[PDB]
């Protein structure tokens, strides 16, 4: 039995909460807080360990974009610092391939990244790889068939609907079919043969629409929309289902957690986080202790 981990986030100020949800009994667990508060970060799992990457600490004492990478061990319930990225990345995108972590775009100060970095766990090192064709922050990133996808985001001027794909063996980026909707800060994940883009901000209102890209047919298609509209949401897949946690709808920071079942193409409210928030890194791994 695995769990859904939610790290950091934002509600009134960046939070350092590490909470976990168990789909089996619907309960939550609070774990060791993050050493430093952060939101706009990305989470991911490698070799059973949880990684909190980038983000920003939006506090009263001031904003501080982070280039930190920290590891959380369910076995000990403790956070250990790792090699830091060559640059701070707020509202970062993250994906994993062959046990390697890819940090995509994000922002630093008023600058929007197009750069990308790859982290080697065993050697504990980061190295820059080919930069995206576009500068993107608030970008959603997912990995399918060992290929990395960068969807939507913001290049400083316009919210994007475009997306591209990175092919490791060639260290090159290639644009792909753009989405039907301009999406910034959407939850992007992979389920079966599709890359999902849920919610986000199109420059006018937080979205509740969800579209998926078929790598084969190379086209996007709208599926059942989520109950709530939500941007800067946490997302992840668990036992053939999409889970979207929190986010901002333009009025309040949501605490609702919706679940998507492809079979019946329907969403359901499955639980609520201990409290509403946005920009939280999400990932799945073994339960603690």
């Amino acid at each position: 039995g695995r769990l859904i981990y939610t790290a950091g986030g934002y509600f009134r100020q960046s939070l350092s909460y590490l909470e976990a949800y168990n789909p089996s009994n619907g309960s939550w667990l609070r774990l060791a807080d993050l050493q430093v508060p952060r939101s706009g970060l990305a989470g991911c799992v490698v070799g059973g360990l949880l990684y909190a990457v980038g983000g920003r600490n939006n506090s009263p004492d001031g904003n501080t974009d982070s280039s930190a990478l920290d590891c959380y061990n369910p076995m000990t319930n403790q956070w250990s610092p790792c090699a830091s990225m060559s640059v701070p990345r707020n509202r970062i995108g993250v994906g994993v391939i062959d046990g390697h972590i890819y940090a995509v775009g994000g922002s630093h100060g008023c600058i929007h990244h197009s750069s990308v970095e790859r982290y080697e766990p065993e050697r504990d090192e980061w190295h820059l790889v080919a930069p995206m064709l576009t500068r993107r922050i608030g970008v959603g990133v997912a990995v399918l068939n060992r290929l990395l996808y960068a969807v939507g985001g913001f290049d400083g001027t316009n919210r994007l609907n475009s997306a591209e794909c990175y092919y490791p063996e060639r260290n090159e980026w290639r644009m792909i079919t753009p989405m039907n909707t301009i999406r910034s800060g959407a939850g992007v994940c992979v389920l079966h043969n599709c890359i999902y883009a849920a919610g986000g901000y199109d420059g006018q209102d937080q979205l509740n629409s969800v579209e998926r890209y078929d790598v084969e047919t190379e086209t996007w298609t709208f599926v059942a929309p989520m109950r709530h509209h939500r941007s800067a949401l946490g997302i992840t897949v668990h036992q053939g289902k999409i889970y979207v946690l929190g986010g901002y709808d333009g009025h309040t920071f949501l605490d609702s957690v919706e679940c998507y079942d492809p079979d019946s193409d329907t969403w359901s409210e499955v639980t609520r986080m201990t409290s509403g928030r946005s920009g939280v890194g999400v990932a799945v791994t073994m339960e603690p202790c």
Partner: peptide, 8 residues
């Protein structure tokens, strides 16, 4: 307020 995230 940031429309996309709701952050101040």
């Amino acid at each position: 307020v940031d429309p996309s995230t709701g952050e101040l």
